[PDB]
């Protein structure tokens, strides 16, 4: 809104031819929007996006707790657990699985038991580098090429 | 001798920079119009909320000589004085359109004088004050502080006549003291409801036998007496006493024992709002997903009705609404009507997100749309590539996915389109659900009005109804708000501002206001005050029926009419009532000085009697 | 236009559950459009897009003429 306000003002000037381009009106709404992003002191970005129906017993949460990846600024790898299928029509991550996969850089599938592994395989068919294992069906098959 | 012409304005309320009430919205939306008039002469004052103020306030440094103009110096020294005595506060700008200046007293920095004040209050106004009631502790704290601050100002300032406007009881305790200490401010007190009004109507009769109840006894009965006293005390100590609406003025007269000097209706920032087809289509998408497998009516012949607002079953008239729809359904079956009414109830309840059944509906109809789109652009390519080369278009491949997508729509035999979109955290006790069960509106094909309860706010990013409330409202055909207790009624009002015909009642503030300004303009007013409960319901069904039997052109007449009522509700026009209230506060305060400014003596019994 | 119509007709049948999809009206404006592409017998597709202000002398034209492309 603010930027097109500016574009309109810049054009209308030039076209008429013959410095704070942001009036007070615009600075107020900008400032509110910026402050609304302040988080309560010591609040770190959650490791999980959802409400866990068994928060204390969950294997994933508990393991990332035991390794203490809590998303603090010092941490150079951030941790996001999204316990639900991906759908384009979501408030949080508005992508279908196939969109999301494509927009990533590396898929990691360190499987221990996996007679094939359709997930890493289709990951690869979508043009995304991937890590599998020599005990994965797909991995094994890949190791022979 | 003070300047009536060029005066100060101090507006006080609990909600100043913390949305705790609906007053927050009034104050916020009024800012622009008053800041334009008073510039830096206007201040809002309120209790500092330590949890939120940082998201809403541009903290300013108030000691810098620049912070105030020279004439406005006195306020600054006034604040200065307060800090000496150890009264801590946040000066600053409230980050809303208009950006009015704001004084937010830290109620903790004054919590000391707690006992000393509870006492001093009782021994000047006989207002009791238990210690388990935090709100009144807070409202006394706030009160003594603001009165304090204002004496100070009135002391230091001697050029500007000073008016001080207080909203709702929680910010009213200052009002008695200002009168007691003979402080030199004219005061104004607006109540947006009465304590007793709410409490008496919180069970399920009112507008008749309110004139004959022992208030002192009923306040007693609710553990309210001390609160009641603050609300009354504020109402008599004010130089000008007002309520937001005519209907509430009548409630106030008999429950607080003082006839309001006028009405201060709530206006809106009408620009902030100002499509129907474009948005109706998004509601259509929802309906096809919802009635999939048994979509047996014509969307070109269906009308959308809706109700919205806080979930107050009886007070917002959800009971009449559903009941009236059941009775509207009969009338349309018997009359053998060609039309369908799908009626949404948008009222946030406790819920566990969308039902699996309702999510599927949408996804399967969305996939059908996708397949059809893929298939028809294929035909396009094939028709065009034939034509350009000159000299069953559906191949078997497309037929197969088409067929699959249509089979996905069939629904289990005897399963009907749900009356609710969400998982209710109380399916058995819910007032709405149980009432539509009672009237057996279950969405069966015979049923000519369909029912859709959506117990959550509307967001455009939702898998179900991909609209924002403002979008949904525009998409609809008629808003229905049969409220029984409702001092203003923002939702019908802002519904109308968006150009959507609506039904309110004469016991809504908005309704009652609207009455004095018939049905051709897209506002029906149900008489809930003088007809019996049943005759009211029947009058509601009459307005609905009439609206259903409206020709395509009769409806576009109305729509166009209401849309022009929108300018009537802007603060540009409604703000003039705040001016009559202020100028009556002045006329009453300095009768002599006021005659000199006007050239005669004007009448001072009401704001309307003045102008 | 024709295909968005076909689209809406296929979608409405489907959404309602429980062969020529081009109706006569469409076949008509379709035929007209195809016929307007017919070119006058023996008229080839031009080797030029523009009106030449010196058609006879132009080097380019004449050289493609000389090679009969």
């Amino acid at each position: 809104e603010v930027t097109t306000s500016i574009g309109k003002r810049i054009f209308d000037h030039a076209i008429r031819y013959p410095g704070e381009l942001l009036k007070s009106s615009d600075k107020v709404m900008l400032k509110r929007r910026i402050l609304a992003l302040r988080r309560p002191e010591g609040q770190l970005p959650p490791i999980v996006t959802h409400n866990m129906v068994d928060d204390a017993n969950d294997l994933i949460l508990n393991k990332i707790r035991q390794v203490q990846l809590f998303n603090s600024p010092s941490d150079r790898v951030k941790m996001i657990f999204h316990p639900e299928f991906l759908n384009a029509n979501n408030p949080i991550l508005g992508l279908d699985y196939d969109e999301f996969v494509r927009g990533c850089h590396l898929g990691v599938f360190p499987s221990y038991y996996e007679p094939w592994g359709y997930t890493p395989a289709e990951c690869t068919v979508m043009g995304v580098p991937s890590i599998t294992t020599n005990v994965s069906g797909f991995g094994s098959y890949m190791e022979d090429l | 001798s003070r300047d009536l012409q060029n005066h100060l304005l101090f507006e006080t309320a609990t909600e100043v920079a913390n949305r705790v009430g609906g007053i927050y919205s009034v104050l916020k939306s009024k800012a622009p119009i008053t800041v334009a008039q008073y510039k830096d002469h206007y201040h809002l004052i309120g209790p500092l909320n330590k949890a939120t103020y940082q998201n809403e306030v541009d903290i300013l440094d108030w000691k810098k000589p620049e912070a105030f103009s020279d004439e406005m110096r006195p306020v600054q020294h006034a604040l200065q004085t307060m800090e000496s005595r150890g009264v801590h506060f946040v000066y600053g700008r409230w980050l809303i359109e208009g950006a009015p200046k704001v004084i937010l007293f830290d109620l903790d920095s004054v919590r000391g004088y707690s006992n000393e004040w509870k006492g001093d209050l009782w021994s000047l106004v006989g207002i009791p004050s238990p210690e388990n009631d935090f709100e009144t502790n807070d409202a006394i704290l706030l009160g003594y502080t603001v009165a304090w601050f204002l004496g100070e100002v009135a002391h230091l300032d001697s050029q500007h006549a000073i008016v001080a406007h207080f909203h709702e009881w929680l910010a009213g305790v200052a009002l008695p003291l200002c009168r007691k200490r003979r402080i030199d401010v004219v005061t104004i007190f607006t109540t947006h409801a009465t304590l007793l009004g709410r409490y008496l109507c919180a069970s399920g009769d009112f507008y008749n036998c309110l004139e004959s109840v022992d208030v002192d006894h009923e306040a007693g009965r609710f553990g309210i007496y001390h609160r009641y006293c603050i609300e009354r005390a504020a109402a008599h100590s004010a130089d000008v006493f007002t309520t937001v609406s005519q209907i509430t003025a009548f409630e106030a007269e008999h429950l607080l024992k003082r006839k309001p000097d006028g009405i201060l209706p709530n206006g809106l920032n009408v620009i902030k709002f100002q499509l129907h087809a474009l948005k109706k289509e998004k509601i259509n998408d929802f309906v096809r997903g919802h009635f999939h497998g048994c979509f047996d009516f014509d969307l070109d012949n269906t009308l959308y009705f809706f109700i919205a607002g806080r979930y107050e079953y009886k007070n917002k008239g959800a009971d009449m609404f559903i009941e009236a729809l059941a009775r509207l359904n009969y009338r349309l079956k018997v009359s053998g009507s060609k039309k369908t009414v799908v009626a949404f109830i948008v009222m946030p309840a406790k819920n566990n997100s969308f039902t699996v059944e309702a999510l599927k509906g949408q996804a399967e109809v969305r996939a059908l749309e996708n397949t059809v789109h893929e298939v028809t652009t294929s035909i396009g390519k094939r028709i065009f590539d034939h034509a350009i080369r000159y000299p069953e278009l559906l191949k078997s491949s497309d037929k197969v996915m088409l067929k699959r997508r249509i089979l996905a729509l069939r629904r289990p035999e005897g399963q009907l389109p749900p009356i609710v979109t969400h998982n209710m955290v109380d399916d058995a006790n819910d007032l709405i659900l149980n009432k539509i069960r009672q009237v057996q509106l279950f969405n069966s094909p015979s049923d000519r009005v369909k029912m859709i309860f959506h117990p959550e706010f509307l967001n455009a990013n939702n898998p179900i109804l991909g609209l924002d409330y403002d979008e949904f409202v525009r998409g609809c055909h008629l808003g229905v708000f049969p409220s029984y207790y409702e001092p203003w009624g923002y939702t019908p009002a802002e519904c109308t501002v968006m150009g959507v015909p609506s039904i309110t009642t004469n016991v809504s503030g908005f309704g009652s206001y609207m009455e004095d300004l018939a049905k051709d303009y897209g506002i029906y007013i149900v008489d809930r005050r003088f007809k019996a409960p049943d005759e009211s319901v029947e009058q509601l069904v009459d307005y609905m029926e009439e609206f259903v039997k409206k020709t395509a052109a009769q409806a576009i007449n109305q729509r166009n009419r209401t849309e022009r009522l929108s300018d009537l509700l802007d603060w540009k026009r409604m703000g003039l009532e705040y001016v009559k209230a202020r100028q009556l506060a002045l006329r009453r305060g300095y009768p002599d000085q006021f005659r000199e400014l006007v050239g005669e003596e004007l009448n001072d019994s009401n704001m309307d009697a003045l102008a």
Side-chain angles (χ1 to χ4, degrees), chain A, chain B:
Chain A
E1 282 176 17
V2 158
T3 61
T4 85
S5 243
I6 301 178
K8 278 229 266 273
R9 273 188 290 273
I10 288 179
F11 179 92
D12 193 292
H13 182 242
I15 206 63
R16 236 81 193 199
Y17 201 94
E20 199 173 327
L21 258 173
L22 284 173
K23 35 197 198 71
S24 53
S25 170
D26 292 319
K27 276 181 152 194
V28 166
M29 46 171 154
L30 264 183
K31 264 193 206 151
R32 188 164 205 202
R33 295 285 125 247
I34 298 189
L35 291 182
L37 297 185
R38 171 192 308 283
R39 59 196 331 156
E41 252 157 13
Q43 188 164 115
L44 302 165
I47 58 192
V48 74
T49 61
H50 278 68
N51 282 317
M52 297 303 278
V53 177
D54 187 33
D55 202 278
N57 296 349
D58 187 71
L59 299 163
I60 300 257
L61 283 178
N62 284 322
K63 215 289 144 57
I64 104 210
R65 284 161 173 155
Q66 174 254 287
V67 297
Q68 296 188 312
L69 288 156
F70 286 111
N71 282 336
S72 60
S74 348
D75 284 323
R76 222 91 290 291
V77 309
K78 325 287 177 177
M79 207 56 189
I80 304 288
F81 180 21
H82 183 271
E84 191 63 291
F85 297 90
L86 296 162
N87 271 280
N89 56 122
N90 291 335
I92 263 37
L93 201 18
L95 293 169
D96 292 324
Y97 184 76
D98 79 294
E99 283 177 285
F100 172 83
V101 163
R102 277 193 162 101
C104 285
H105 302 285
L106 177 80
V108 188
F109 317 101
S111 297
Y112 181 58
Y113 190 76
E114 172 169 277
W116 185 241
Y118 249 119
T119 45
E122 80 175 37
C123 176
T124 287
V125 165
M126 289 186 196
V128 167
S130 42
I131 314 189
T132 180
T133 68
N134 69 357
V135 297
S136 152
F138 173 75
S140 78
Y141 175 73
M142 231 41 182
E143 217 180 22
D144 284 17
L145 315 166
Chain B
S1 268
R2 281 164 145 144
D3 193 8
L4 302 198
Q5 200 64 259
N6 147 71
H7 51 99
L8 260 46
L9 175 49
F10 296 89
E11 212 157 7
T12 304
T14 312
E15 279 92 341
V16 265
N18 61 135
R19 189 183 331 254
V20 177
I23 306 190
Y24 175 101
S25 302
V26 174
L27 293 173
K28 155 168 176 186
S29 75
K30 198 174 51 59
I33 217 49
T34 99
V35 169
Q37 188 193 343
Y38 288 69
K39 261 62 147 43
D40 289 317
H41 291 33
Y42 176 70
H43 292 77
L44 284 146
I45 294 157
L48 174 78
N49 189 334
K50 277 169 184 172
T52 84
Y53 80 112
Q54 293 208 310
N55 300 357
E56 300 213 40
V57 193
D58 194 22
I59 300 189
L60 303 190
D61 186 40
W62 53 272
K63 307 163 143 176
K64 315 198 86 80
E66 287 96 343
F68 298 78
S69 80
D70 273 343
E71 76 185 309
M72 297 289 329
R73 284 281 124 203
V75 176
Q76 197 191 38
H77 307 136
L79 279 157
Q80 282 200 250
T81 306
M82 304 271 326
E83 173 133 285
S84 306
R85 320 271 252 87
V87 191
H88 303 317
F89 51 78
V90 177
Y91 195 66
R93 258 181 242 275
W94 184 13
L95 302 168
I96 346 154
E97 184 176 320
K101 274 176 163 73
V102 143
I103 305 168
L104 303 161
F105 293 101
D106 195 350
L107 287 188
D108 291 323
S109 100
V110 141
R111 183 151 265 92
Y113 309 57
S114 158
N115 281 343
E116 182 199 327
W117 283 342
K118 289 160 70 100
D120 183 276
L121 217 228
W122 162 258
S123 51
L124 298 172
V125 198
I127 294 169
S129 33
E131 40 202 347
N132 52 108
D133 183 348
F134 312 107
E135 288 87 340
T136 73
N137 281 311
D138 282 333
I140 279 154
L141 279 186
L142 169 54
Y144 272 96
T145 312
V146 183
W148 192 342
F149 170 73
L150 285 161
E152 283 300 340
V153 177
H155 175 225
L156 297 158
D157 188 316
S158 63
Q159 171 192 356
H160 306 104
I162 306 176
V163 25
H165 201 142
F166 303 71
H167 286 82
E168 210 64 16
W169 64 273
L170 301 139
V173 185
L175 271 157
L177 317 183
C178 286
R179 199 188 179 67
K180 212 310 135 67
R181 302 178 187 174
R182 220 88 32 144
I183 319 252
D184 200 11
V185 286
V186 281
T187 68
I188 307 190
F189 174 83
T190 293
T191 194
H192 295 258
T194 70
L195 277 167
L196 274 191
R198 309 220 87 114
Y199 276 95
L200 288 173
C201 299
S203 56
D205 181 294
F206 193 56
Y207 297 103
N208 294 317
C209 45
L210 80 71
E211 346 185 40
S212 61
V213 282
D214 185 12
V215 294
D216 286 334
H217 176 252
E218 306 285 357
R221 170 153 84 87
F222 291 111
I224 281 305
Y225 191 71
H226 48 298
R227 287 178 153 186
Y228 174 72
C229 291
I230 290 171
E231 189 157 64
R232 207 200 213 164
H236 297 280
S237 305
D239 293 357
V240 175
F241 175 47
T242 57
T243 49
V244 279
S245 62
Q246 257 311 143
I247 182 56
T248 290
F250 160 79
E251 165 189 346
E253 173 145 3
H254 294 91
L255 298 173
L256 295 184
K257 317 295 174 182
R258 167 169 181 186
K259 168 168 198 152
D261 294 312
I263 293 314
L264 296 169
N266 294 339
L268 302 87
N269 234 27
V270 162
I271 193 175
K272 154 177 199 144
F273 300 84
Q274 310 154 327
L275 268 185
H276 167 74
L278 188 72
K279 264 50 218 286
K280 193 205 158 185
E281 255 311 310
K282 282 229 211 83
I283 295 170
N284 290 335
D285 294 340
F286 164 78
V287 175
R288 304 207 208 82
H290 195 255
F291 294 71
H292 70 91
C294 61
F295 179 44
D296 51 59
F297 47 99
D298 189 1
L299 291 194
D300 278 356
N301 222 26
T302 84
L303 295 187
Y304 296 132
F305 289 6
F306 85 95
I307 189 175
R310 231 170 308 114
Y311 193 161
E312 273 175 74
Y313 178 63
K314 176 86 196 294
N315 288 350
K316 289 301 182 211
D319 59 346
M320 260 194 45
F321 183 57
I322 297 155
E323 182 69 42
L325 284 166
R327 281 141 98 139
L328 173 65
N329 186 40
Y330 190 111
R331 300 211 185 163
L332 293 174
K333 286 219 267 51
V334 162
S335 89
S337 181
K338 30 154 180 168
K339 302 178 170 303
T340 314
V341 167
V342 179
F344 303 82
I345 296 192
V346 181
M347 285 192 160
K350 272 289 190 174
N351 64 87
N352 293 306
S353 211
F354 305 100
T355 61
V356 133
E357 169 166 356
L359 285 168
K360 183 178 187 173
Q362 306 308 308
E364 300 284 32
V365 167
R366 220 93 302 124
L368 206 215
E369 289 171 354
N370 271 11
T371 290
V372 166
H373 173 78
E374 275 177 21
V375 166
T376 64
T377 95
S378 259
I379 304 186
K381 285 227 258 274
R382 285 191 289 267
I383 294 175
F384 175 98
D385 191 283
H386 168 255
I388 202 61
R389 234 75 185 201
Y390 198 91
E392 197 174 333
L393 268 171
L394 280 198
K395 35 200 206 69
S396 36
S397 163
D398 294 322
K399 273 186 154 190
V400 149
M401 39 177 176
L402 252 174
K403 180 174 284 192
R404 173 160 225 190
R405 299 273 121 257
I406 297 176
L407 287 181
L409 295 181
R410 177 195 307 290
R411 54 192 330 152
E413 253 154 26
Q415 159 168 131
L416 292 171
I419 55 182
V420 70
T421 64
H422 286 58
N423 285 317
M424 301 306 284
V425 193
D426 194 23
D427 212 272
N429 288 351
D430 196 82
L431 285 156
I432 306 263
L433 277 174
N434 283 348
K435 215 280 137 74
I436 90 208
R437 278 157 186 158
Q438 181 247 292
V439 302
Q440 294 172 312
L441 285 177
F442 284 128
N443 287 330
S444 48
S446 329
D447 282 342
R448 219 81 299 281
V449 325
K450 317 284 187 178
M451 209 62 190
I452 299 285
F453 178 22
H454 187 274
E456 195 52 273
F457 294 94
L458 286 169
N459 281 287
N461 51 120
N462 274 352
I464 261 58
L465 210 14
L467 294 184
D468 274 339
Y469 174 82
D470 82 278
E471 278 181 309
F472 174 76
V473 169
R474 291 199 162 87
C476 281
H477 293 280
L478 183 78
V480 183
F481 322 99
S483 311
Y484 178 72
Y485 189 81
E486 159 165 287
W488 186 239
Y490 252 108
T491 50
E494 89 167 26
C495 174
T496 288
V497 169
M498 289 175 190
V500 175
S502 30
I503 300 182
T504 173
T505 67
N506 67 5
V507 284
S508 141
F510 177 66
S512 70
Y513 177 62
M514 228 36 173
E515 219 170 23
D516 316 358
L517 307 175
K519 310 183 311 194
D520 297 310
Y521 280 96
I523 308 178
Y524 302 59
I525 300 167
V526 168
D527 181 337
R528 267 258 224 174
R529 195 172 164 187
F530 306 120
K531 312 197 179 195
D534 202 276
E535 311 172 49
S536 291
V537 162
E538 287 302 314
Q539 186 183 7
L540 210 209
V541 193
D542 293 341
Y543 286 130
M544 270 162 176
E545 188 164 11
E546 166 185 329
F547 190 73
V548 187
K549 317 200 159 197
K550 223 139 189 157
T551 74
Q554 283 183 296
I556 310 203
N557 271 349
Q558 208 180 23
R559 263 268 180 160
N560 280 337
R561 272 185 270 264
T562 89
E563 196 161 6
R564 280 179 296 167
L565 280 167
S566 101
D567 286 299
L568 274 198
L569 297 162
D570 193 81
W571 276 120
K572 263 129 206 170
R573 171 175 168 272
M574 306 259 277
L576 307 184
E577 295 311 295
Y578 269 84
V579 175
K580 303 179 186 176
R582 301 196 198 100
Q583 300 231 284
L584 177 77
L586 292 183
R587 164 65 171 83
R588 285 189 189 187
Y590 315 122
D592 296 315
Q593 325 205 220
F594 196 97
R595 183 166 317 166
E596 322 280 324
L597 204 80
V598 172
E600 64 214 48
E601 51 179 322
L602 289 167
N603 189 356
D604 80 338
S605 16
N606 331 314
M607 335 191 325
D608 277 350
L610 184 54

